[PDB]
Amino acid sequence: GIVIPPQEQITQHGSPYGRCANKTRALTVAELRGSGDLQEYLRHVTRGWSIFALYDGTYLGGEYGGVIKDGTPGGAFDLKTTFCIMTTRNTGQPATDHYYSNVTATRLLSSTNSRLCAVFVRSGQPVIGACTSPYDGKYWSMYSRLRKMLYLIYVAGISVRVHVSKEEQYYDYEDATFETYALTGISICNPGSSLC
Amino acid sequence: GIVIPPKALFTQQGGAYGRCPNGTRALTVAELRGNAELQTYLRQITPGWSIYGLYDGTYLGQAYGGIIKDAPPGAGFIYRETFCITTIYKTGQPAADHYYSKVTATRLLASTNSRLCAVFVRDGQSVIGACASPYEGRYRDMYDALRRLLYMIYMSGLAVRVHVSKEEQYYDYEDATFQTYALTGISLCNPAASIC
Amino acid sequence: DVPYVLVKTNMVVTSVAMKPYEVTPTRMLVCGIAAKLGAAASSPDAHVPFCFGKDLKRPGSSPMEVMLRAVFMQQRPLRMFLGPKQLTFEGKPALELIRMVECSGKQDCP
Amino acid sequence: DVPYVLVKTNMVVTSVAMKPYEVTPTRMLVCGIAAKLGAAASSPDAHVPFCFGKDLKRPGSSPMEVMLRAVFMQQRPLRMFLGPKQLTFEGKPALELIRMVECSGKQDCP
Amino acid sequence: DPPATVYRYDSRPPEDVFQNGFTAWGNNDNVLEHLTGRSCQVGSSNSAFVSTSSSRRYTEVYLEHRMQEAVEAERAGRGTGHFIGYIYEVRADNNFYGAASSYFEYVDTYGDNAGRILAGALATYQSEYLAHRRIPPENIRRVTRVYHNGITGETTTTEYSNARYVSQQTRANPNPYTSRRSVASIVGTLVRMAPVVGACMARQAESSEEAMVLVYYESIAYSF
Amino acid sequence: LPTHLYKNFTVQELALKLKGKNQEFCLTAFMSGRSLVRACLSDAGHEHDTWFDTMLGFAISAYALKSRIALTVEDSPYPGTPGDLLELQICPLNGYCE
Numbered sequence: 001g002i003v004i005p006p007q008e009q010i011t012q013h014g015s016p017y018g019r020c021a022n023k024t025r026a027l028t029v030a031e032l033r034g035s036g037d038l039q040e041y042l043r044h045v046t047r048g049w050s051i052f053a054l055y056d057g058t059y060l061g062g063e064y065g066g067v068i069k070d071g072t073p074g075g076a077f078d079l080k081t082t083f084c085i086m087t088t089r090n091t092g093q094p095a096t097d098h099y100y101s102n103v104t105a106t107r108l109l110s111s112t113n114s115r116l117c118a119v120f121v122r123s124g125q126p127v128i129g130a131c132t133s134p135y136d137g138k139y140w141s142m143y144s145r146l147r148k149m150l151y152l153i154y155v156a157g158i159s160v161r162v163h164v165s166k167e168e169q170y171y172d173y174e175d176a177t178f179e180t181y182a183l184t185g186i187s188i189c190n191p192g193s194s195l196c
Numbered sequence: 197g198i199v200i201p202p203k204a205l206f207t208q209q210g211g212a213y214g215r216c217p218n219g220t221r222a223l224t225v226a227e228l229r230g231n232a233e234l235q236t237y238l239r240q241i242t243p244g245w246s247i248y249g250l251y252d253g254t255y256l257g258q259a260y261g262g263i264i265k266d267a268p269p270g271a272g273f274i275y276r277e278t279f280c281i282t283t284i285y286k287t288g289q290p291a292a293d294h295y296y297s298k299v300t301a302t303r304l305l306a307s308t309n310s311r312l313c314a315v316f317v318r319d320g321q322s323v324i325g326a327c328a329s330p331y332e333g334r335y336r337d338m339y340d341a342l343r344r345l346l347y348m349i350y351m352s353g354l355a356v357r358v359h360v361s362k363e364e365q366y367y368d369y370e371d372a373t374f375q376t377y378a379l380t381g382i383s384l385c386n387p388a389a390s391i392c
Numbered sequence: 393d394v395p396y397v398l399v400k401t402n403m404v405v406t407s408v409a410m411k412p413y414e415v416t417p418t419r420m421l422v423c424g425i426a427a428k429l430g431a432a433a434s435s436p437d438a439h440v441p442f443c444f445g446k447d448l449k450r451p452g453s454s455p456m457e458v459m460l461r462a463v464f465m466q467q468r469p470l471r472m473f474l475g476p477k478q479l480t481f482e483g484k485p486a487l488e489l490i491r492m493v494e495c496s497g498k499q500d501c502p
Numbered sequence: 503d504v505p506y507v508l509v510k511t512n513m514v515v516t517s518v519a520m521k522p523y524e525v526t527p528t529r530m531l532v533c534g535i536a537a538k539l540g541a542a543a544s545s546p547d548a549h550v551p552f553c554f555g556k557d558l559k560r561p562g563s564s565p566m567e568v569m570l571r572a573v574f575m576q577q578r579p580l581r582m583f584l585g586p587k588q589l590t591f592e593g594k595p596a597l598e599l600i601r602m603v604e605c606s607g608k609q610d611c612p
Numbered sequence: 613d614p615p616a617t618v619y620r621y622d623s624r625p626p627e628d629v630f631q632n633g634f635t636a637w638g639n640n641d642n643v644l645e646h647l648t649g650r651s652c653q654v655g656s657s658n659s660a661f662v663s664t665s666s667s668r669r670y671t672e673v674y675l676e677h678r679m680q681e682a683v684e685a686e687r688a689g690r691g692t693g694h695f696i697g698y699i700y701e702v703r704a705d706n707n708f709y710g711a712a713s714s715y716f717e718y719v720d721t722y723g724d725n726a727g728r729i730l731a732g733a734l735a736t737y738q739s740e741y742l743a744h745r746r747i748p749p750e751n752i753r754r755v756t757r758v759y760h761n762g763i764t765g766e767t768t769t770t771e772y773s774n775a776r777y778v779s780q781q782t783r784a785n786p787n788p789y790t791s792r793r794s795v796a797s798i799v800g801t802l803v804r805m806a807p808v809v810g811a812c813m814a815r816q817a818e819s820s821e822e823a824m825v826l827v828y829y830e831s832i833a834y835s836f
Numbered sequence: 837l838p839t840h841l842y843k844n845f846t847v848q849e850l851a852l853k854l855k856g857k858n859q860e861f862c863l864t865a866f867m868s869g870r871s872l873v874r875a876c877l878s879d880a881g882h883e884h885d886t887w888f889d890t891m892l893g894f895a896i897s898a899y900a901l902k903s904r905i906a907l908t909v910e911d912s913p914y915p916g917t918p919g920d921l922l923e924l925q926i927c928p929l930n931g932y933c934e
């Protein structure tokens with residue numbers, strides 16, 4: 001199901017010591033594997049008997065062909081270069097209130113200088129994921145208030161109805177079995193209440 | 197034995213009607229009674245027959261023989277002249293990490309535009325007083341972070357090692373049997389991690 | 393207003409409120425109702441209205457604001473230095489709170 | 503510093519802390535100790551310290567604080583990206599955190 | 613050293629207590645569930661534990677505050693304004709196990725992710741001691757009645773003593789009570805507000821002579 | 837602006853959302869016999885106004901603490917539309933607001 005980072009998400013120069021720069025992240029195997037556009041981009045630019053680090057594995061390119069060898073998390077950080085995907089995609093869609101009712105916030109994610117996200121579930125299965133960030137985003141203003149509500153529903157285990165804007169797509173999660181967009185509102189609601 | 201506010205901290209501009217100006221606090225008698233120099237400074241500044249308010253008692257002008265007459269809290273406020281002292285002492289000691297471990301936070305105290313404070317206590321015996329203000333202090337920017345945790349360790353019965361600098365000595369507490377300095381950092385005790 | 397500073401004791405903050413500072417827009421008031429522990433509902437100190445100003449320009453929370461919140465949820469006895477100034481929480485006046493220390497015991501708080 | 507970024511899984515933060523950044527007064531750390539489940543006390547993974555930067559110029563809470571708090575209070579396990587830098591906390595070296603993610607299951611936290 | 617005596621605040625009177633002691637709501641002897649309020653939760657009460665506290669001071673403050681609640685009630689026009697509290701002195705034998713040890717132990721047997729932090733922070737703050745199963749008349753050696761007239765500000769102390777009290781030299785059991793891993797999905801540590809008090813301890817004290825507001829300790833352990 | 841006071845009510849619904857550029861929050865305060873009191877607060881436009889954040893937090897803690905509250909909502913200009921909240925008070929924990 002995995003959401004595959006679109007081709008252009010990728011950094012021009014991969015990064016050192018496994019330290020994918022700020023606002024970006026290690027590309028995965030199961031993600032490179034699913035990306036045709038990507039495998040091609042790679043082989044069409046991998047010289048020598050070069051191997052690359054993937055969050056969960058390695059990429060033997062150039063003379064090696066363009067092989068995706070499986071691996072262990074952070075294991076290939078041993079190498080010289082780890083391929084990095086960018087996490088922020090400017091979807092360029094409409095600012096429409098897509099809402100997902102009855103969800104419960106889970107799996108929090110945070111990174112230096114980037115966003116705070118949560119995988120909103122329902123019956124255990126995910127549904128959507130959203131994030132808030134004070135540095136980057138259209139709704140930088142909203143972070144202060146959002147973190148607050150987010151925190152409560154989280155520890156409290158409070159069921160809610162979440163509101164997102166699809167104008168921004170996020171690849172912050174590894175092997176996203178669900179999408180991830182910009183958090184816009186959280187509602188501790190009454191079924192059918194005009195407040196949701 | 198209590199800690200005695202050094203003469204220097206004597207506000208030349210006394211508070212009016214027990215309203216010590218901001219950042220200053222009503223001098224107690226146990227203190228004035230203990231500060232020889234201050235007393236002495238007084239004999240020479242107190243004009244004949246004047247009465248002075250303190251937190252506890254009253255101080256009569258040398259015409260009356262110059263006396264530290266006891267009295268109940270804020271009784272002496274009935275009089276205009278009130279003996280106040282500024283709560284911050286620039287120790288001169290060098291900025292450095294001093295810390296006490298296995299303490300707990302207690303005795304929250306708060307002036308108006310000054311420090312929030314606490315008395316860290318170990319096994320019943322009060323150990324040290326720390327303060328943190330977003331208005332004055334070599335660390336006035338660490339307030340917002342610290343205040344948040346000061347608070348958590350406060351509701352929870354959580355034990356901590358507290359780092360304190362002695363470059364600033366705080367006298368917000370009246371008649372203390374412990375010293376007060378500027379809060380530099382807190383660290384939840386963790387035996388296994390070898391903290392406490 | 394009052395002519396001098398009252399100093400209550402063994403007071404527990406029993407209730408909090410946030411209201412706009414009718415006079416000034418950059419500020420609002422944090423109001424509460426302290427009440428001497430134990431005292432008969434009849435006693436004068438069994439219902440003491442107080443408020444303090446909070447500047448809406450600076451971010452964060454004034455020390456008093458954090459203590460007020462901590463001692464409220466924990467209902468800890470204080471030593472409120474009230475007045476002399478007064479604001480108007482609940483229509484009726486209320487004295488400005490200008491300092492507060494937790495009670496160590498009978499020694500500092502009788 | 504350390505050579506390359508370490509990625510530990512099934513960690514739970516058991517302490518938490520704050521201190522200043524020895525380099526500047528415009529920043530400060532937010533250390534903490536994490537433990538890996540299963541790891542015996544002999545194992546070095548049962549006591550892994552860390553810290554991150556917090557800018558004292560941007561008032562408020564970083565997404566990483568906000569998370570730390572939540573996952574701490576809740577004893578949530580986690581995938582942590584530490585290194586390659588080492589920072590000092592409690593007089594010892596500790597691996598700078600650059601990103602963490604709550605553990606969903608063995609499928610991502612082996 | 614383990615305690616010898618514990619206290620227990622209760623709203624049940626001596627003629628009742630001295631003759632029947634206390635008995636746990638249920639058989640769930642799971643440390644974490646009780647320590648976290650789950651087994652004392654309204655309509656989920658079954659902890660095989662009788663809450664006590666080795667700190668009289670502790671009990672005194674809870675009562676001291678419960679009393680004030682009365683005054684504040686009558687002030688609003690809810691209460692008559694009177695109060696009657698009891699603080700029982702109990703001989704803690706080796707059937708009383710500490711909440712601390714027991715918590716910290718269930719954790720270092722199941723995993724740090726298996727137990728919530730505040731819930732242990734809380735067990736320490738209550739010096740709670742778990743009387744497993746029941747605590748019999750024979751151990752209750754005294755009581756302190758507390759009448760208060762919030763209307764006139766009159767507090768009246770009076771200590772009656774149990775005759776059935778058997779004296780023997782005992783101390784609480786040093787070895788923590790060991791439970792099996794919980795199975796329950798605990799959300800957080802339920803605790804009664806102002807002052808903070810353990811949902812068991814605070815809830816077992818009430819009897820027949822309104823709904824108790826239990827909140828999750830974590831939802832407010834950090835300010836909003 | 838026919839202001840009103842509703843005492844000894846609880847917060848049943850709490851929610852933060854967007855309203856044009858500005859954002860707002862609202863609460864349903866409720867008393868068993870009585871109906872629902874819906875009050876909202878939005879961005880004052882003037883930026884620095886800690887008010888929204890402050891009032892918001894306060895409201896969350898009220899929500900959190902499960903305590904009764906006292907709200908002074910101004911008046912709703914058109915039926916259906918929640919009134920603008922101007923005052924918040926947390927009733928003595930465990931008790932009621934007198």
Ligand SMILES: CC(=O)N[C@H]1[C@H]([C@H](O)[C@H](O)CO)O[C@@](OC[C@H]2O[C@@H](O)[C@H](O)[C@@H](O)[C@H]2O)(C(=O)O)C[C@@H]1O
Nearest residue numbers: 097098099100101102103122126127128161162196
């Ligand atoms: C963007 C969008 O399609 N939002 C929908 C939402 C999502 O599809 C949902 O959160 C994920 O399944 O569905 C909404 O309706 C919920 C409603 O859906 C019915 O089909 C179902 O029979 C009901 O039980 C109930 O779940 C929602 O908000 O959740 C509408 C929303 O517009």
Ligand SMILES: CC(=O)N[C@H]1[C@H]([C@H](O)[C@H](O)CO)O[C@@](OC[C@H]2O[C@@H](O)[C@H](O)[C@@H](O)[C@H]2O)(C(=O)O)C[C@@H]1O
Nearest residue numbers: 293294295296297298299318323324357358391392
């Ligand atoms: C400023 C300073 O002296 N800090 C010491 C500190 C104090 O001496 C202590 O607070 C006094 O009670 O001691 C520290 O160590 C912990 C503690 O360990 C005991 O075993 C020992 O007997 C004590 O003297 C004391 O050392 C502390 O953090 O409390 C170390 C610190 O350098």
